Structure 1
């Protein structure tokens, strides 16, 4: 009982660890990829219009 009643606190810390790690490894790369796509698309439009 003691083992499990402390593994619950282990998971209580794990939820916030997953919050931070998942944010870092998913949300920020998605934002960076969106910005990259935006800029490359803008460059492609700028090239195509004047060609």
Structure 2
């Protein structure tokens, strides 16, 4: 029982590094990569619009 009372404190740290931290890193990646996709599409839109006018 004492061994598993320490297994709790274990998983609480392992899960932070295995489950939480990478999901949080993925969120930051997705956000700053989305700004780049948007930036390229607005610049491309302006180019196509200028080419038409």
Shorter-chain-normalised TM-score: which range? 0.7 to 0.9
Unmatched 5+ stretches in structure 2? 45-53
RMSD: 0.4
How many residue pairs get matched?
44
Question: TM-score, normalization: structure 2?
Answer: 0.80
Whichever of the two has the greater Rg, that structure is: 2
Cα distance, 1:29 vs. partner? 0.2
Give every structure 1 segment of 4 or more consecutive aligned residues whose post-TM-superposition deviation is greater than 3 Å.
Answer: none
